[PDB]
Design a protein around this ligand. Structure first.
Ligand SMILES: Nc1ncnc2c1ncn2[C@@H]1O[C@H](COP(=O)(O)OP(=O)(O)O)[C@@H](O)[C@H]1O
Ligand SMILES: [Mg+2]
Length: 213
């Protein structure tokens, strides 16, 4: 019989406001969520790549540097996996919700004046575009310094973090998007290919799309 510890965190006030704004307003051009998550994996892959030329053993639990897109039409999930640097516990809590982001207020002002959600990345809050298409997001991550953790949120002002006792990943981050009922086009291979081609073609790392069938 298992016992697992969970910790519940409140999103920083403006992050929570941004989150509600994302979820509760209609926005065209939602497909940009994919560009934001892939840029995040590309950034984490640059990170491990550079860290390793200083200390090669950092590639022990993780040699290949790439991105995998995994739609699941049974689960209604869309998973973006990278073999990037990953996140420590502190990186998860601070980076994903707890600490104020300096661009937050500016972006909301931008949006309320009619800006395209596409501008989100320039404001340092690109991760949150995930909520344009997903009702719940799960982040599984593994950094060399630590154990694997699972971050999770359905918005509402809180997120949870717990040590993951699930499939081990070695090193990297996996963003699992539990898609809203009406956002299932993001599970289709043709559309995923369309949006990567439109928005994500200068990634310095190979991206593979895995289609169940
Ligand atoms: N796939 C990932 N791998 C590692 N860290 C990540 C990943 N996705 C997000 N992060 C962390 O979350 C932070 C917030 O991401 P985001 O909201 O996109 O803003 P930005 O990329 O401009 O900093 C990143 O700066 C990074 O530290
Ligand atoms: Mg980003």
């Amino acid at each position: 019989m298992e016992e697992e510890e969970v910790e519940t965190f409140a999103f920083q006030a403006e992050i929570a406001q941004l989150m509600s704004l994302i979820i509760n307003t209609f926005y065209s051009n939602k497909e940009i969520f994919l560009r934001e998550l892939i840029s995040n994996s590309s950034d984490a892959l640059d990170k491990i790549r550079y860290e390793s030329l200083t200390d090669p053993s950092k590639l022990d639990s993780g040699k290949e540097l790439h991105i995998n897109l995994i739609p699941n039409k049974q689960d209604r999930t869309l998973t973006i996996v990278d073999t990037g640097i990953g996140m420590t516990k502190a990186d998860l809590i601070n980076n994903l919700g707890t600490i104020a982001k300096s661009g937050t207020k500016a972006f909301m002002e931008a949006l309320q004046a009619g800006a395209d959600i596409s501008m989100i990345g320039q404001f340092g809050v690109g991760f949150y575009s995930a909520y344009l298409v997903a009702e719940k997001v799960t982040v599984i991550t593994k950094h060399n310094d630590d154990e694997q953790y699972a971050w999770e949120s359905s918005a509402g002002g809180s997120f949870t973090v717990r040590t993951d006792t699930g499939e081990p990943m070695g090193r990297g981050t996996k963003v699992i998007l539990h898609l809203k009922e009406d956002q299932t086009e993001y599970l289709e291979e043709r559309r995923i290919k369309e949006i990567v081609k439109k928005h994500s073609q200068f990634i310095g790392y190979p991206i593979t799309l895995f289609v169940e069938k």
